[PDB]
């Protein structure tokens, strides 16, 4: 029993965090085998950021300009290349703590653990989701660039995010581990703003199924809805459209509780209309959208209360 | 910017988790040096049940390697299993008993394999609102101060309301609980007042000031108000502990108390604070200072 925002154990990722310094800038890098991955803006000054020409800034650098530190040991840089917005630093020592890993690009609505680091040293771990507007509502201070987001389903670490910047609203933007940004963002100091955000509908439904699994049914009703009528209502509350893929993905949770997806959709419509009326669902007075259908199945029991 | 429920990096603790089996029961153990610590209910008078067990009855598994038990003893509600191999991944550690209101990270494990990490607080009623399933017994609670892991909790049981109960690493329970199948219930809980105030300061630091007002209060007037809403009494120690956050924001502790009094009597009125429609009490003043400063381990 119970329902918490749960992160993956961070140990496999802690053993990969290093400090990367270039000139005056210091940020974090991910050391996997003999390569250290870090944001390419490590080669920039604050002035450069307005309109940086990364190719021009990089051609002026040599291997010995990049200082890499793993614990209290200096790593020697023997090569460098740029892949999109990530800098790949070839080092002379392979990381003996390199875990089984994959680089994965996630879609909005997906969740992951973030290991926030400063000076190549881990300070905290938290769970978050890729918002529909491609930003993340993280907790980051200056020096956190290069911190990574990951999942550890089984014993393989899937790296999905690398931190690059904070937007004016306090939200965060970054890339996958191949250097491609999530969203229409650039690693440039230009007028950039997060688009209007929406609620991840399939995630709120998953969390309502988790509440039913944990014994709470107060929010259910005798009504059903068509997928189209649900979406016409959902759009009015800034909820993402629910697709037939989302309905299929919620199938197992629907079978475990005996509540059809479109009947759970009718309950969500009613909650949006009425509010909670002094009640909570899983210790929350708001509708939670940062637990996916897969996280609910992983955390919750296979036996409904 | 941003304010999240943040746990300590769990790596130093992951390297200590083992699986303990005795008869039909399988739960988790904490392997530090040549001793494995686990709940004494794995053997289920515990001395009479224990005297009937031999070293070879306890099967300990560290990864895919079987550890050999060479001795056993009981300390309160924890079983200490002496093993022939010292854990090479043993970190610098202390066993600490925490007070209600204090927070810690829990590394939830099943079959000696860590599956998740989350942050939580020791409630005033000595229970924890955790997330555990059958097989989670032996999962531990910890804090990290510099390079030293402070183990403060070991999971033993789930109460009928879905809340959790356990011991410190010396086997002493938090709360009036016993490790047996008997009618046990969590007492009425209260809100950790010093923690809600710390979280209000964290909201101000992150640019949320709508709840601030021109008013101040006395500790005595506020404590009458707090007692009416099932909030823990605020002591002068709590006021002193909130000093740094008060200086950083320019909001006196009793100035922030008048804001909390207004939120308690009037509600939020369709507004949220740090993305929450409820007043959050699971961030201590030290947690707020640490997250809004970037302390590393
Ligand atoms: O935003 C930047 C620098 C920067 C400026 C413009 C573009 C790029 Cl790619 C990077 N650093 C940063 C990351 N996260 C935080 C949190 C707080 C303060 C600063 N943070
Ligand atoms: O509570 C017990 C069994 C038990 C019975 C009587 C005494 C003692 Cl100490 C333990 N196990 C348990 C722990 N956490 C959970 C979560 C869910 C279900 C079961 N859980
Ligand atoms: Cl995805």
UniProtKB/Swiss-Prot annotation, chain A:
Locate residues linked as Glycyl lysine isopeptide (Lys-Gly) (interchain with G-Cter in ubiquitin): 5, 90
Q: Where is the Peptidase C30 domain?
A: 1-305
What is the stated purpose of this protein?
Cleaves the C-terminus of replicase polyprotein at 11 sites. Recognizes substrates containing the core sequence [ILMVF]-Q-|-[SGACN]. Cleaves and inactivates human TRMT1, preventing tRNA guanine(26)-dimethylation of tRNAs. May cleave human NLRP1 in lung epithelial cells, thereby activating the NLRP1 inflammasome pathway. May cleave human GSDMD, triggering alternative GSDME-mediated epithelial cell death upon activation of the NLRP1 inflammasome, which may enhance the release interleukins 1B, 6, 16 and 18. Also able to bind an ADP-ribose-1''-phosphate (ADRP).
Which residue ranges are assigned to the Cytoplasmic compartment in the record's topology?
1-305
Domain of life (superkingdom)? Viruses
Q: Known activity regulation?
A: Inhibited by pyridone-containing alpha-ketoamides compounds 13a and 13b. In turn, alpha-ketoamide 13b (tert-butyl (1-((S)-1-(((S)-4-(benzylamino)-3,4-dioxo-1-((S)-2-oxopyrrolidin-3-yl)butan-2-yl)amino)-3-cyclopropyl-1-oxopropan-2-yl)-2-oxo-1,2-dihydropyridin-3-yl)carbamate) inhibits SARS-CoV-2 replication in human lung cells. Inhibited ex vivo by michael acceptor inhibitor N3. Inhibited ex vivo by compound 11a and 11b.
Q: Where in the cell is it found?
A: Host cytoplasm; Host Golgi apparatus; Host nucleus
- Give the annotated active site: 41 (for 3cl-pro activity), 145 (nucleophile)
Q: What is the effect of changing residue 142 to A?
A: Does not affect ability to cleave and inactivate human TRMT1
The molecule here is called 3C-like proteinase nsp5
Reactions mediated catalytically: TSAVLQ-|-SGFRK-NH2 and SGVTFQ-|-GKFKK the two peptides corresponding to the two self-cleavage sites of the SARS 3C-like proteinase are the two most reactive peptide substrates. The enzyme exhibits a strong preference for substrates containing Gln at P1 position and Leu at P2 position
Organism, per UniProt? Severe acute respiratory syndrome coronavirus 2
Q: How does it assemble?
A: 3CL-PRO exists as monomer and homodimer. Only the homodimer shows catalytic activity. Interacts with host FBXO22; this interaction promotes the proteasomal degradation of nsp5.
């Amino acid at each position: 029993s119970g329902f918490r925002k749960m992160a993956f154990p961070s140990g496999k990722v802690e053993g990969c965090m290093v400090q990367v310094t270039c000139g005056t800038t210091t940020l974090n890098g991910l050391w996997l085998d003999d390569v250290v991955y870090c944001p390419r803006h490590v080669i920039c000054t604050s002035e450069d950021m307005l309109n940086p020409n990364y190719e021009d800034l990089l051609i002026r650098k040599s291997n010995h300009n990049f200082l890499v530190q793993a614990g209290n040991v200096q790593l020697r840089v023997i090569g460098h290349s740029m892949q999109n917005c990530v800098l790949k630093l070839k080092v002379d020592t392979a990381n003996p703590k390199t875990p089984k890993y994959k680089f994965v690009r996630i879609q909005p609505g997906q969740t992951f653990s973030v290991l926030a680091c400063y000076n190549g040293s881990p300070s905290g771990v938290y769970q978050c989701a890729m918002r529909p507007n491609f930003t993340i509502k993280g907790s980051f201070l200056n020096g956190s660039c290069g911190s990574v987001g990951f999942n550890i389903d089984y014993d393989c670490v899937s790296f999905c995010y690398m931190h690059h910047m904070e937007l004016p609203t306090g939200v965060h933007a970054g890339t996958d581990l191949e250097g491609n940004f999530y969203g229409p963002f650039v690693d440039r100091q230009t007028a950039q703003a997060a688009g209007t955000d929406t609620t991840i509908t399939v995630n709120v439904l998953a969390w309502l199924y988790a509440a039913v699994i944990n014994g709470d049914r107060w929010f259910l009703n005798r009504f059903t809805t068509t997928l189209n009528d649900f979406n016409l209502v959902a759009m009015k509350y800034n909820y993402e459209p629910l697709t037939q893929d989302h309905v299929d993905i919620l199938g197992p949770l629907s079978a475990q509780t005996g509540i059809a997806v479109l009947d759970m959709c009718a309950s969500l419509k009613e909650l949006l209309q009425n509010g909670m009326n002094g009640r909570t669902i899983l210790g929350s007075a708001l509708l939670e959208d940062e637990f996916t259908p897969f996280d609910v199945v992983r955390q919750c029991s296979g036996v409904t209360f």
